[PDB]
Amino acid sequence: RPRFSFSIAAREGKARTGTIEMKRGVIRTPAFMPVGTAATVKALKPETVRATGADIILGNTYHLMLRPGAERIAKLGGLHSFMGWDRPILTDSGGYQVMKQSEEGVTFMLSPERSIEIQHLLGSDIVMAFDECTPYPATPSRAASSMERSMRWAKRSRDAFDSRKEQAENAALFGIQQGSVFENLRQQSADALAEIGFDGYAVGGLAVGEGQDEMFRVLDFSVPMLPDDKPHYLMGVGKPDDIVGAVERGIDMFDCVLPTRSGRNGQAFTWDGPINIRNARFSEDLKPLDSECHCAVCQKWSRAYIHHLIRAGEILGAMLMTEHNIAFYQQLMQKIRDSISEGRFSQFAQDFRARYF
Amino acid sequence: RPRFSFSIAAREGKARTGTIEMKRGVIRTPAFMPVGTAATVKALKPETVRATGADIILGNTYHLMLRPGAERIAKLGGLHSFMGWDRPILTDSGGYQVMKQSEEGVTFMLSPERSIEIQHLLGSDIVMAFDECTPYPATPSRAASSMERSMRWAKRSRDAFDSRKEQAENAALFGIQQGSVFENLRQQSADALAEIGFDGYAVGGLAVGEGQDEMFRVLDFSVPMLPDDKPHYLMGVGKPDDIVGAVERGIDMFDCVLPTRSGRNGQAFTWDGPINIRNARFSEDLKPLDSECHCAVCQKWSRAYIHHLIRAGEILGAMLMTEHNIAFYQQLMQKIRDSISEGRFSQFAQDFRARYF
Ligand SMILES: [Zn+2]
Numbered sequence A, B: 001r002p003r004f005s006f007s008i009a010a011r012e013g014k015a016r017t018g019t020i021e022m023k024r025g026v027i028r029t030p031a032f033m034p035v036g037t038a039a040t041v042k043a044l045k046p047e048t049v050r051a052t053g054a055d056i057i058l059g060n061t062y063h064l065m066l067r068p069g070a071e072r073i074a075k076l077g078g079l080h081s082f083m084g085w086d087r088p089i090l091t092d093s094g095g096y097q098v099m100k101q102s103e104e105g106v107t108f109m110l111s112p113e114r115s116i117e118i119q120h121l122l123g124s125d126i127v128m129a130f131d132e133c134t135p136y137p138a139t140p141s142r143a144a145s146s147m148e149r150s151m152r153w154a155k156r157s158r159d160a161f162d163s164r165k166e167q168a169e170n171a172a173l174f175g176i177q178q179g180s181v182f183e184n185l186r187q188q189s190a191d192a193l194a195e196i197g198f199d200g201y202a203v204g205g206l207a208v209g210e211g212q213d214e215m216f217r218v219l220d221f222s223v224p225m226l227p228d229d230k231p232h233y234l235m236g237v238g239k240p241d242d243i244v245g246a247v248e249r250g251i252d253m254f255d256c257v258l259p260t261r262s263g264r265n266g267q268a269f270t271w272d273g274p275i276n277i278r279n280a281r282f283s284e285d286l287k288p289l290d291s292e293c294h295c296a297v298c299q300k301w302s303r304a305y306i307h308h309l310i311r312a313g314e315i316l317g318a319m320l321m322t323e324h325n326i327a328f329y330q331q332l333m334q335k336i337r338d339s340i341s342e343g344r345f346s347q348f349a350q351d352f353r354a355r356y357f
């Protein structure tokens, strides 16, 4: 395979379906990337994460630079070897979780140059530029100041990435659009990033308190500003209906802790909406978590059993809820891909929402 | 298969190797039975427990009668269905964990009759008589009083088991020898149990503070008192060297929480002795937990990785340590069985101890 190639196989409106090819594997888009720790996903072995349909995972840079340390992980052969995951890994820059700020970077020092080096040491396949997620709400002036700094950091990230031969030849680099909810700043930010040039473009600065209507409003004008021929990554999103609406607006990639964190807390996703498995109504329910789901958990155990495990604080309850919720998210993405491929994504979006809500 | 048949295929001294056949499967002896919760083993799926070589698991009656309740579990199809484990399950009587005592039973009411009924409701394949584990040390008088009561409870257990057709036809019942460390009381207890008649005989009242020398001393005279043609179960044992010495003294079956509990706490068993994986010396150690172990954990992850996971409190660290330690225990039992089968168990016991210590 090549270092990076994004191919769009089918379109419906602003929605797209395709593949990213990289050296470590192929990523089907639109893609959901499960997030981890030193685990590929909390409470799951890498083979389980793969079995659920994940093509790529999100490496938690902040966690890992803290302990065991990026240099240690490099010494040990890199994050793929350490974890036992041989497919692509997208690493975050560590920016969001760390947020004294200066033009140099953040002290808490994490600069664009250090961030790109740490992602190199982990052995990232998709490297994120180091940015600042502007808080919401933001005044036009603060949004502009913050976006401008982020674009300067994006150039510093590009050059740090490019100055490292092994990294430039084997990994990809994504830039991140800022500008809060303001159309003109989003345009300035898209223009700045495309001038620098990246392999993919994220939409940053959303899912930070503005709510779905506003987030969709901002995506409506913001995604068409990015290059069409590159992947579009919406950071930190989200709930199943957020994902469907974002794909309707041209998003190709997603990450969120919701399926994993929700799962350990007792929330299971189903095609009829989420359920809280601790509720007494499930104590003798012999049905699987979801009636249609293809995952190993829904083939083998009942709601009643998982209800007991979560109420009892058992680790196996966390394992089983997490495997089902990450499988549900991959089945959602497969249904989105197939529906766009078949020209029926609009109907799928409406059928999904009618049942889910 | 039959309801219960124990066959001895080979002997060396007092050590024996063979099989117990039951309706749900065959149990290779000497056997280690992993202990659970509502999980077959904490942090493991039933297929993982099987993959480690377990033929039978120990069902935690006390935990399960408390929540979700034995009647609920019966309503849901029994513990095998609930858990997803279709092989034999030995249930404890709930006695030990509950320990106002009376001749009727314990109030905390758990009587011999209730205990046998709860084990029926869970759907146990090997049912334990309800007894009292005499505290150590005990005066001759208290040991005798307690043993006498236990033998009366053993008769009550036999008759409760026998009065229930489905249970008498499909499950087995084991009696438990008491008598503390006193030879004459151990003999009285063996005689009483053999008069009643059971499918197997446990040695109770040990591993309760007396230490290995005393426990071995008591096993030396106590196991030959039990019927030779039935299995001998040493309850609550133990460390790998305890297991080897007990097999040298005629024990066929074991249960203990040590591999599972130890594992979650960071202790890994190896042929060179246990290690504490949290120790700094393992932070960059790329070797597997044990150099010879055949388990999936030792095939795929390093000491260094598991060190990080346990230090970080990750659930995956508990999962991986537990799978390795239960696999180590099954490999120990396989080495014991093969060595007795080949007439070289004495040499195995000595080689094992020289390396382990
Ligand atoms: Zn499922």
Ligand SMILES: [Zn+2]
Pocket (backbone or CB within 6 Å): B289, B290, B293, B294, B295, B296, B297, B298, B299, B324, B327, B328
């Ligand atoms: Zn192992």
